[PDB]
Design a protein around this ligand. Sequence first.
Ligand SMILES: NC(=O)c1ccc[n+]([C@@H]2O[C@H](COP(=O)([O-])OP(=O)(O)OC[C@H]3O[C@@H](n4cnc5c(N)ncnc54)[C@H](O)[C@@H]3O)[C@@H](O)[C@H]2O)c1
Ligand SMILES: NC(=O)c1ccc[n+]([C@@H]2O[C@H](COP(=O)([O-])OP(=O)(O)OC[C@H]3O[C@@H](n4cnc5c(N)ncnc54)[C@H](O)[C@@H]3O)[C@@H](O)[C@H]2O)c1
Ligand SMILES: O=c1ccn([C@@H]2O[C@H](COP(=O)(O)OP(=O)(O)O)[C@@H](O)[C@H]2O)c(=O)[nH]1
Ligand SMILES: O=c1ccn([C@@H]2O[C@H](COP(=O)(O)OP(=O)(O)O)[C@@H](O)[C@H]2O)c(=O)[nH]1
Lengths: 338, 341
Amino acid sequence: SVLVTGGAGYIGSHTVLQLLEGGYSAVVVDNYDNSSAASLQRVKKLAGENGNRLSFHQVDLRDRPALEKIFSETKFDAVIHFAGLKAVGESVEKPLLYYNNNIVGTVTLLEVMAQYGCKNLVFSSSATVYGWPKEVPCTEESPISATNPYGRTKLFLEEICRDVHRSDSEWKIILLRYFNPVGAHPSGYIGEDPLGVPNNLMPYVQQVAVGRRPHLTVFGTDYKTKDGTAVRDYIHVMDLADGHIAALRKLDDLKISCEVYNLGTGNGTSVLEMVAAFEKASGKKIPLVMAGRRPGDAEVVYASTEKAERELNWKAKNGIEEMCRDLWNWASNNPYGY
Amino acid sequence: AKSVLVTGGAGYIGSHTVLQLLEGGYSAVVVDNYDNSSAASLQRVKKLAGENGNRLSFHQVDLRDRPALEKIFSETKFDAVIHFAGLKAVGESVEKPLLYYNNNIVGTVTLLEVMAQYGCKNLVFSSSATVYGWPKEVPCTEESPISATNPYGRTKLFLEEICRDVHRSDSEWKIILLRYFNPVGAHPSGYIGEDPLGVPNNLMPYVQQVAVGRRPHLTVFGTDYKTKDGTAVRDYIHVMDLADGHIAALRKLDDLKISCEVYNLGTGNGTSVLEMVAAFEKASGKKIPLVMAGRRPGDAEVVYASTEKAERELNWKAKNGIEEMCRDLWNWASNNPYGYN
Ligand SMILES: NC(=O)c1ccc[n+]([C@@H]2O[C@H](COP(=O)([O-])OP(=O)(O)OC[C@H]3O[C@@H](n4cnc5c(N)ncnc54)[C@H](O)[C@@H]3O)[C@@H](O)[C@H]2O)c1
Ligand SMILES: NC(=O)c1ccc[n+]([C@@H]2O[C@H](COP(=O)([O-])OP(=O)(O)OC[C@H]3O[C@@H](n4cnc5c(N)ncnc54)[C@H](O)[C@@H]3O)[C@@H](O)[C@H]2O)c1
Ligand SMILES: O=c1ccn([C@@H]2O[C@H](COP(=O)(O)OP(=O)(O)O)[C@@H](O)[C@H]2O)c(=O)[nH]1
Ligand SMILES: O=c1ccn([C@@H]2O[C@H](COP(=O)(O)OP(=O)(O)O)[C@@H](O)[C@H]2O)c(=O)[nH]1
């Protein structure tokens, strides 16, 4: 039995489905800031028999009575915490919004969790905590420093989790630094369906590919990379989902405390390479506006996979070609989302 | 004709600072939740401010209570906000980090948001020398590396960062981050001073608690340091001089080429824990039984301020020395041994 925060969202979507399919039970809480209930209806059907073990509610983590009601009626073995705003660029423009939602929401969740004696957490952290890396592939113990308010929320919230653990050794925490999840379930029955104007690269791309946005703005062209565009470690959302189930099994291992794990593929890809990958998979051509660097972006970021392999027995198995096929497969069949 | 909201204004530094605002011609509205104070301090500031008492207003309000705070900002054109409110004990922060993060960050964020809503984007923030961490170079300059070593110190580091983010987001904001060193003492009248609720975590309130007989002994946190007496060295400033620094900061806030500046408020001198205990014993005539214990989680070896920048840009320099600090502490305590009764 698992509480999934922001589980109507992109990665949450997929992870819930994986939980359901792995024998677990799931309660989702989500305020539908960047998702709708409709995504979980599709996870329900897609999950088949196991779909009877999913239940979901419209709750803001900051609504403490609403969240208390949730933990009242169910004992949680673990919380998986995906809820938050996640856009570097929105961040720089709207810092309070982000410290409000991410830190206040999370602090409330940690407080309620303790109050009801659920003290095992998997936390959605981000490669953004590496800020602008000095070193080729970012290890877990690389220097941690943020560059923008979203980065700082995640960095701050990791430090806050370390502080909780240290205060109270009943707590079992795993911090997962996701690099750049992309793709969809290969069925194409679910996928990324952000509300509002999209912020992430590939939901923006899919929407341009389908008529919903006029062009993709490329953020920066003078980077010190082989084609001038920024480089990221793009990872198949389904691999990312699976790594959460491995986090979950790791939670009651030997003597875990407050462990951090990168979840990436270890390979860097430029924004243009991603475009071109997407165009290969889609056969559609993406109009591009070349713009300046987006405030807050790192230049090259990609994972060390070694710690996650050694300790979670987890590795990503899909490559770019798969991520784009699955995305296109979801996008083709679901051009307006849900 | 100037109007100031003081968060945490019932507290040690807030109380003294509110008094100096009043004597200074300012009008002050205080919002406190009496988590670590009582109304008595502001009753007493009123009387002491004399005629200027008429310009003090005090509401009992938690910064996290957004409706209440909106009400306050509705009814009064505030020219600037001094934000003192928060939990401050590093020992408690380690045991209860959520309390600290919750109160300190939710509290501040909600204030920043209400301020921005009602067009009051002038902030003077209670930061702390604790964000200097374990400093490589002393004196500690406003340019030096910043860092925290415990939850409390994280709330100040993180909030400075947030203020910096808010500034970058929105150039209307003018923000001074005041890094207090170690406030000590009381109004020389003896009529007000520090009175924390429950167990004091700061060194000198704990000392005066032992001296009047509330507390059996002072635990010395560290005797194995690389100081002249092996005890931790800090920069202790008269709270009354700290308060004048706020007046200096408010004046400064009315300068064009300001946006988000750090100023140290210290004396620039270091004093061991045992030197402060010796100086208090001289001021009071009391013996302070000492338990020698280990270092406190996060404590720095040596921390004192560079005063250079605050001298040049704020036109402010601490005027009281250690003897004066201990004289007024004792003048307040002797007569109010258990605080506002
Ligand atoms: N997608 C990425 O590239 C990436 C990379 C690293 C880390 N992350 C983090 O992973 C998590 C999930 O990412 P995602 O791509 O699934 O984002 P998403 O927006 O698809 O999902 C997040 C969900 O959180 C919900 N939510 C937001 N604030 C909430 C609140 N206060 N209370 C309740 N629900 C709330 C949203 O409605 C949304 O459904 C986030 O914490 C994000 O910051 C994402
Ligand atoms: N005193 C020091 O040694 C020192 C050193 C560095 C920084 N500081 C900072 O200076 C500020 C003032 O310190 P102080 O010595 O006056 O402490 P204090 O405890 O006397 O003052 C804090 C005041 O804030 C109030 N308060 C706390 N949380 C509140 C909330 N959520 N809403 C409303 N009121 C709230 C308390 O009731 C109290 O009156 C604090 O922010 C502290 O962290 C103090
Ligand atoms: O409209 C967009 C969205 C993203 N990106 C770039 O694509 C990469 C992936 O960014 P995204 O926002 O998806 O994730 P982030 O790396 O910020 O977590 C980065 O180099 C972004 O600058 C871009 O150029 N245009
Ligand atoms: O009960 C106490 C409180 C404080 N200190 C020491 O006194 C100095 C100042 O402590 P305080 O907490 O007042 O100041 P901070 O350094 O936290 O701002 C530090 O070296 C503390 O270790 C101590 O020995 N015993």
